[PDB]
Every structure is written in C-alpha cells, then in structure tokens.
Amino acid sequence: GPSGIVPQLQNIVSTVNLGCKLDLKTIALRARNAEYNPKRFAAVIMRIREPRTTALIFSSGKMVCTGAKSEEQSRLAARKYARVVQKLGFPAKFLDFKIQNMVGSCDVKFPIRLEGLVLTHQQFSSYEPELFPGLIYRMIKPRIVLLIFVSGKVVLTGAKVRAEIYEAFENIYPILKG
C-alpha cells in the first residue's frame, strides 16, 4: 500500500491558440512585459507569479505556457495572458486549450541500490553512473519516464494528469521496496 508520501507535482505545461496574427515588435513596444531579441530568437516570453508560470508568444498566434503546480492554475495563467493580449490591442481568443506535460516528484525514505535494479530491469532501465548520476527508467503504462536515485527520491514526467503520476508511483513502489 501507500507509504504515506504522495507525489507532489512540480510543473505543468499547457498551450492555447490565440486565434489571430500578432506583431512581436508591437508587443515589445507596448507591453510592460516582453522580449524581442530576433538576433537570437524572434519571440516574446511572459511570466506571472499568480499563478507562478512562464509563457511564450509568437506572431503566428500560438501560446505555450508552463510553470504552474496544477493544471487548473496553468489554465488560469493562460487566461491571464489572454486578457493581457486582448487589452494589448490584439483580438485574442482563448481557443483550443491543451495540456502538454507535467513533472512530479516523491520519495521512499530508504536507500536504493541501483545495481540490483539494472541487473533485474535492464530491458527498460538504463543505468550509466559516468555522466548522469541517477538511473533512467521508461515506463509504458502510462507513457512515463522515471528518474531514480540512491537517496530514494524519484522524478516523474511524461503524463497528462496527476492520476497517471499517482498510478505510476504505486506501480513502481513494490519494485522500489524489493
């Protein structure tokens, strides 16, 4: 059963279609929050604290936002940037909101001997202590990629909802225990 520690989400990734053409130079000229460094990259990157997130905008009318701790928080930040662009003088719309990725982490509070895991799980676990200190495991159900360390803490990514993170956590937990 559960060890009493829940996987806390660390990140959320989401995108929405603004539905109109925008001028990045105009945004950099008007908005009190903007980049335009075309010498490096022709784009504008936002960020707000409530929710704590970073978003990025193009002239093509797409938005990519990331940084929240919950999917609904990410959507709130997305709608905040949509409001900002609407009051920037652009006819922005909050259309086709899609959630792309999230990151979570947890712990088991006992040491992990990676050698046994690689010896019994090499077919899906990649161990290489020379470059990346931890161990890499790719999980199929659901499409999750997992990082495991000796300290017992685990990083989970590749899901679309917190339920997937929890379910993968409890799938791996017996393996971590033994």
- 37 annotated as belonging to a binding site for a ligand: no
Q: Does 44 bind DNA (CB under 7 A)?
A: no
Give the distance between the most distant pair of CA atoms in the chain: 60
Is 168 in contact with 139 (CB distance < 8 Å)? yes
Q: Does 92 bind DNA (CB under 7 A)?
A: no
Q: Does 54 bind DNA (CB under 7 A)?
A: no
Q: Does 129 bind DNA (CB under 7 A)?
A: no
Q: Does 62 bind DNA (CB under 7 A)?
A: yes
Which range, of 27-35, 98-106, 108-116, 163-171, touches DNA by CB under 7 A?
98-106
Q: Which is nearer to DNA, 58 or 173 (CB)?
A: 58
SS (H, E, C) the chain: CCCCCCCEEEEEEEEEECCCCCCHHHHHHHCCCCCCECCCECCEEEEECCCCEEEEECCCCEEEEECCCCHHHHHHHHHHHHHHHHHCCCCCCCEEEEEEEEEEEECCCCCCCHHHHHHHHCCCEEECCCCCCCEEEEECCCCEEEEECCCCCEEEECCCCHHHHHHHHHHHHHHHHC
Q: Does 147 bind DNA (CB under 7 A)?
A: yes
Among 11, 54, 86, 105, binds DNA (CB under 7 A): 11
Among 5, 45, 88, 103, binds DNA (CB under 7 A): 103
- 33 annotated as belonging to a binding site for a ligand: no
Q: Does 58 bind DNA (CB under 7 A)?
A: yes
Strand partners, 59: none
- Residues annotated within the binding site for DNA are 11, 47, 62, 101, 138
Kindly list the residues in this chain that would bind DNA in the complex (CB under 7 A): 11, 13, 15, 43, 56, 58-60, 62, 64, 100-101, 103, 131-133, 136, 143, 145, 147, 155, 157-158
